[PDB]
Write a protein that binds this ligand. Structure first.
Ligand SMILES: [Ca+2]
Ligand SMILES: [Ca+2]
Ligand SMILES: [Ca+2]
Ligand SMILES: [Cl-]
Ligand SMILES: [Cl-]
Ligand SMILES: [Cl-]
Lengths: 238, 209
C-alpha cells in the first residue's frame, strides 16, 4: 500500500596507484586516483498495515563517475607520517562531499601511500652515512658494464631483500634522489629506473649527515630537514 | 673524591648503546691513534703549527662507512685547509670516494663512504693545530675522538653492507679502539690535563722549573 523507493546502500569502486611522499610534504596528490565510480542500491516496496516492511525490488541507479570530486580531507604526509621499523605504507581514506565512502566490501575506501625521510636510502628511519654509501654503491654497480637499475637493488633494507624490482626499491630511489636535475618535471611517480641516482646524490646525503652531526645544523636537520637539503644541494645558500 | 675537569675541553663522548654493544668478538678490531706531540720547552712550542694525525690500524679492506667527532683544547687554533675545512683526508681514505670534514667549533666531524670495503689502514684525517703564543711549560692541550648519538643519527664505523660483523667492528671501534670515559687513557699527560677521555695531545714538558 503506497510503494516508494529509497537508497539502501551506497559504495564506491576505486582504481588507484601508489604514491611516494616525504614526511615534510603538506599535500597528497589526487593523481593517485585514476577512477572512482559511485554505486547506489535502491529498494522499492511498501509497509503493510501490520507495520512490516515488504521489499518488492532491489536495483541500482546508473553508476556515477566521481573521480574528480575525491579528496584526502585533512590528511597530509606530514600529519600522517610515523616512524615504524620496516613499515612505510599507509591507507589514506578518500572523501566525497566531506565524508568517507565505503568500498564494495563495506570498508572505508582508501588509497595507499608510502612516506619516508628524504635521504633514507636503507629505509631505517635514519639519515646517515650508511645511506650515502648505499647510494654510492648503487651508482658504482649500475655504472658497471652489464648492470642497470633492473639488475641491481639500491636499498639494503630487508623490505627490498636484494630484489631490484621491489616497490620498496622504487621508494628508496625516490628518497635517495636528493639531487634531481630535471626538478619538478620528474614527478614523484617516477620508477627507480627512470631516475638518476649518482655520486652527486650520494655526496649530498653525506653532507646532510655531516651537517646534522655538528652543533650549527643539528636542530635544522631534525626540525626542518628541507632547509638543510636546500643548503646541501645548492638550491639555497649559507 | 673531588671532581676534576680539563682546562679548556669538555667530554662530549657518549656511552656506546647500540646492539651489539660488546665488540670483543669482532673479526675486525680497528684502533685509532692520535698524535701525541711533546715539546721540550715553551719557546719550542709557542706559535707552532702541529700536524695532528688520526691513524687507523687493524682494518685494512674491512670498512666503508665512517663518521666520528674530533674536538680539541679551545686554546689551540685550527689552521683550515684551502677550502676552509678543519680536517683533510689522508691516505687511508684514498680509495673512498666519499669523504667530508665538517667544522664544529673547537672540533670537526669527519665521515667517509665507499662503494665496497675500500677503507684502508693509515692516516684517515689530519688537522693542523697552532699552539698559543702564551703557552707555558707543563701545559697540555688534549685532543679527543668522541662517539656521539641521538635518535636522529649517530657516529659510524662499519662495512659496506653494515653486516653483523660490521656492527661488531663498530662497537669495537668506539668502545676499545678509541679512549673515552669508559676506556680512559692512562697517559701521564692526559691524566695531568684531567682529560683521560681524550686521545692525543700537544704537550710541553714541565720545567726544572
Ligand atoms: Ca637510513
Ligand atoms: Ca639524482
Ligand atoms: Ca675520546
Ligand atoms: Cl622545478
Ligand atoms: Cl650479516
Ligand atoms: Cl684500550
Amino acid at each position: 500500500n503506497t510503494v516508494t523507493s529509497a537508497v539502501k546502500t551506497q559504495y564506491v569502486e576505486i582504481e588507484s596507484v601508489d604514491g611516494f611522499y616525504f614526511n615534510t610534504e603538506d599535500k597528497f596528490d589526487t593523481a593517485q586516483i585514476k577512477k572512482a565510480v559511485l554505486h547506489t542500491v535502491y529498494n522499492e516496496g511498501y509497509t503493510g498495515d501490520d507495520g512490516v516492511a515488504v521489499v518488492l525490488r532491489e536495483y541500482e541507479s546508473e553508476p556515477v563517475d566521481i573521480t574528480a570530486e575525491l579528496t584526502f580531507g585533512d590528511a597530509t604526509p606530514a600529519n600522517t607520517y610515523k616512524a615504524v621499523e620496516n613499515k612505510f605504507d599507509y591507507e589514506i581514506p578518500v572523501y566525497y562531499n566531506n565524508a568517507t565512502l565505503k568500498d564494495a566490501e563495506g570498508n572505508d575506501a582508501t588509497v595507499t601511500v608510502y612516506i619516508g625521510l628524504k635521504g633514507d636510502t636503507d629505509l631505517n628511519n635514519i639519515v646517515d652515512g650508511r645511506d650515502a654509501t648505499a647510494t654510492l654503491t648503487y651508482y658504482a654497480a649500475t655504472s658497471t658494464d652489464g648492470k642497470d637499475a633492473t639488475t641491481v637493488a639500491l636499498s639494503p633494507s630487508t623490505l627490498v631483500g636484494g630484489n631490484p624490482e621491489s616497490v620498496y626499491d622504487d621508494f628508496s630511489a625516490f628518497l635517495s634522489d636528493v639531487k634531481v636535475d630535471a626538478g619538478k618535471e620528474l614527478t614523484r611517480f617516477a620508477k627507480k629506473a627512470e631516475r638518476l641516482i649518482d655520486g652527486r646524490d650520494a655526496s649530498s646525503i653525506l653532507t646532510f649527515y655531516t651537517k646534522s652531526s655538528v652543533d650549527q645544523y643539528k636542530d635544522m636537520a631534525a626540525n626542518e630537514p628541507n632547509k638543510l637539503w636546500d643548503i646541501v644541494t645548492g638550491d639555497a645558500e649559507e | 673524591h673531588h671532581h676534576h675537569h680539563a682546562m679548556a675541553l669538555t667530554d662530549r663522548g657518549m656511552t656506546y648503546d647500540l646492539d651489539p654493544k660488546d665488540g670483543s668478538s669482532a673479526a675486525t678490531k680497528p684502533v685509532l691513534e692520535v698524535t701525541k706531540k711533546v715539546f721540550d720547552t715553551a719557546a719550542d712550542a709557542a706559535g707552532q703549527t702541529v700536524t695532528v694525525e688520526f691513524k687507523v690500524s687493524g682494518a685494512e679492506g674491512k670498512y666503508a662507512t665512517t663518521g666520528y667527532h674530533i674536538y680539541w683544547d679551545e686554546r689551540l687554533e685550527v689552521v683550515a685547509t684551502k677550502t676552509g675545512a678543519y680536517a683533510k683526508k689522508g691516505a687511508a681514505l684514498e680509495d673512498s670516494s666519499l669523504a667530508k670534514a665538517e667544522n664544529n667549533g673547537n672540533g670537526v666531524f669527519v665521515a667517509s663512504g665507499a662503494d665496497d670495503d675500500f677503507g684502508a689502514d693509515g692516516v684517515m684525517w689530519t688537522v693542523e693545530l697552532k699552539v698559543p703564543a702564551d703557552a707555558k711549560a707543563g701545559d697540555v692541550y688534549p685532543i679527543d675522538v668522541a662517539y656521539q648519538w641521538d635518535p636522529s643519527k649517530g657516529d659510524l664505523f662499519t662495512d659496506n653492507k653494515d653486516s653483523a660483523q660490521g656492527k661488531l667492528m663498530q662497537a669495537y671501534f668506539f668502545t676499545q679502539g678509541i679512549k673515552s670515559s669508559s676506556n680512559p687513557s692512562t697517559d701521564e699527560y692526559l691524566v695531568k690535563a684531567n682529560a683521560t677521555y681524550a686521545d692525543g695531545y700537544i704537550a710541553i714538558k714541565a720545567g726544572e722549573p
